[PDB]
From a paper:
Ribonuclease A was one of the first enzymes to be studied by X-ray crystallography. The commonly accepted residues associated with the active site of Bovine [name] are Lys 7, Gln 11, His 12, Lys 41, Asn 44 and His 119. Waters W86 and W91 make interactions with imidazole groups of His-105 and His-119, respectively. Both His-119 and His-12 are known to be involved in the catalytic mechanism for cyclization and cleavage of RNA. The crystal structure of orthorhombic Bovine Pancreatic Ribonuclease A has been determined to 0.85 Å resolution using low temperature, 100 K, synchrotron X-ray data collected at 16000 keV (λ = 0.77 Å). This is the first ultra-high-resolution structure of a native form of Ribonuclease A to be reported.
The space group is: P212121 (19) and the unit cell is: a = 43.9980 Å, b = 45.6970 Å, c = 51.8900 Å, α = 90°, β = 90o, γ = 90°. Refinement carried out with anisotropic displacement parameters, stereochemical restraints, inclusion of H atoms in calculated positions, five SO42- moieties, eleven ethanol molecules and 293 water molecules, converged with final R values of R1(Free) = 0.129 (4279 reflections) and R1 = 0.112 (85,346 reflections). Five SO42- moieties and eleven ethanol molecules were located and refined in the 0.85Å Orthorhombic [name] structure designated SO41151 to1155 and EOH A201 to A211, respectively. In the orthorhombic structure Lys-7, Gln-11, His-12, Asn-44 and His-119 occupy single sites while Lys-41 is disordered into sites A and B and the SO42- group into sites A (60%) and B (40%). The A site hydrogen bonds to His-12, and Gln-11 while the B-site hydrogen bonds to Gln-11, His-119 and a water molecule. In Orthorhombic RNase His-12 H-bonds to the SO42- group both directly and via a water molecule. There is good clear electron density for this residue which has been modelled largely as a single conformation but with a minor branch at the end.
Numbering used by the authors: 1 to 124
């Protein structure tokens, strides 16, 4: 089975594009990255940075996760990210998403040995 670290990568990393400029980026990526089985996953963010630069966030600014737990880390810099949010007319199995692009700080939850991202907690 897919580890938590691997799931974070599949769901949240997109190092090979620098940004989403296409209105169809999320429609394609949510399907490609296996986020549309059974139900459309409603909301998901992709990060357009190298895996090593995202992994490096686990030793950046320690902050609380949005549930108040202490294993979250905010990137010092903004990073290029894309939010994918299921539209108000989307109907599974034809999952439809609004793509929005921005530079924002990311907040990841890290766990394990090695201590790596396992959840995309928030953006700032």
């Amino acid at each position: 089975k897919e580890t938590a670290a691997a799931k974070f990568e599949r769901q949240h990393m997109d190092s090979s594009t620098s940004a989403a400029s296409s209105s169809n980026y999320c429609n394609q990526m949510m399907k490609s990255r296996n986020l549309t089985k059974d139900r459309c996953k409603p909301v998901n963010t992709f990060v357009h940075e190298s895996l090593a630069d995202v992994q490096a966030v686990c030793s950046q600014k320690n902050v609380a996760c949005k549930n108040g737990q202490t294993n979250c880390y905010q990137s010092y810099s903004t990073m290029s990210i894309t939010d994918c949010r299921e539209t108000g007319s989307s109907k599974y199995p034809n999952c439809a998403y609004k793509t929005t692009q921005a530079n924002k700080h990311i907040i990841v939850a890290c766990e394990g040995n090695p201590y790596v991202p396992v959840h995309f907690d928030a953006s700032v």
